[PDB]
């Protein structure tokens, strides 16, 4: 299905290179997802990150292959629980979903997309969305991030 | 005569510190409006601020950087001559300031101060002689760029 990575306890501190992404909560809905800064350019000798819009919450992640590949339009969405979100098995834990809202249009049959559910926010397979005559989503899920544990 | 100066590289301690950023040329106006309560929480070290902010930097958890907590801010400089009281090397700088410790009280410490034209770092004792009671914040650490 989709690539999923568990962040190691203290992996961010030991990393050589890092990406920074705006954060959204599950409860706060679709509105804050769209309002989040789209153009996140990092430059200079200090790798200073400047966004177009002001933002409140942020996440620091190591430069994973598919994550750094996004550039413009990257975002991370928080979840309290992994059950009502993941299509397959969960483990009853908080979750971060990295999305590329630049390619929000459904085209990949095997890829997964962030969509507004009749209740909150869920993850859908492209083929299932195509069945419902749904073309535009909130963005394609690039990576699912799982928390450090013992 | 010298404040803690560190060259940036990518381990130092155990974690990481995120600081809101101000460009020096963009003025003191931005430095003061920058968010004060920059708290990282949850399983993922997700940073949440009081005010929304456009510029941010990631630094390793250096001893004097991690000690700040609230009021921490990083200040960009294109050059180091106009700012440092002693020797420069003609290069950009990040000046990490503790805006909580803004009151001039340490004689040997350096404080971030408004000049007529730009920003300066001034020695506490020199400020005290001028009867300058407040500054923009105490200079905690100076970050230099990575050496190629």
């Amino acid at each position: 299905r989709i690539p999923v990575v568990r962040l190691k306890f203290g992996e961010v501190a030991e990393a050589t290179s890092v990406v920074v992404l705006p954060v959204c909560k599950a409860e706060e809905g679709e509105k804050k997802i769209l309002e989040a800064p789209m153009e996140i350019i990092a430059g200079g000798d200090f790798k200073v990150v400047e966004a177009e819009k002001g933002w409140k919450r942020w996440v620091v992640l190591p430069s994973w292959n598919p994550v750094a590949a996004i550039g413009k339009g990257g975002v991370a969405v928080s979840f309290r629980d992994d059950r009502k979100v993941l299509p397959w098995d969960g483990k009853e834990e908080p979750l971060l979903v990295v999305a590329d809202r630049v390619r929000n249009v459904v085209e990949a049959d095997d890829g997964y997309y962030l969509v507004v559910a009749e209740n909150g926010l869920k993850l859908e397979k492209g083929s299932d969305l195509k069945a419902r005559e749904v073309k535009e989503s909130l963005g394609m899920v690039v990576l699912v991030v799982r928390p450090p544990r013992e």
Side-chain angles (χ1 to χ4, degrees), chain A residues 2-7 9-71 73-83 85-117 119-121 123-132 134 136-149:
Chain A
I2 34 159
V4 180
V5 179
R6 207 175 200 96
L7 180 81
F9 188 79
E11 188 182 336
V12 278
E14 298 171 346
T16 297
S17 195
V18 155
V19 180
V20 187
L21 297 157
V23 162
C24 294
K25 296 188 174 191
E27 266 260 31
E28 302 201 73
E30 52 179 310
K31 306 150 197 174
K32 225 152 190 180
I33 291 159
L34 297 163
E35 282 162 17
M38 287 281 290
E39 288 182 306
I40 310 135
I41 318 150
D45 284 346
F46 300 99
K47 297 96 69 175
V48 194
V49 177
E50 51 189 356
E52 48 175 330
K53 323 169 198 194
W55 207 243
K56 221 158 284 170
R57 31 180 63 84
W58 297 86
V59 76
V60 173
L61 291 172
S63 299
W64 287 316
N65 204 62
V67 180
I70 306 162
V75 77
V77 178
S78 299
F79 293 97
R80 290 157 183 81
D81 216 28
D82 56 354
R83 270 88 142 269
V85 196
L86 285 164
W88 36 278
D89 54 79
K91 276 201 175 70
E92 198 180 16
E93 58 181 357
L95 218 64
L96 267 184
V97 167
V98 193
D100 188 6
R101 49 218 206 278
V102 162
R103 50 169 177 171
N104 60 309
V105 195
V106 178
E107 62 172 342
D109 303 289
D110 311 300
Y112 286 81
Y113 292 87
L114 183 70
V115 285
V116 188
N119 38 72
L121 300 156
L123 310 176
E124 285 280 7
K125 198 171 176 288
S127 54
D128 303 331
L129 279 166
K130 284 176 182 182
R132 306 163 201 167
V134 181
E136 268 210 326
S137 74
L138 267 43
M140 193 193 174
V141 177
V142 169
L143 198 81
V144 175
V145 188
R146 310 195 87 144
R149 63 163 185 184

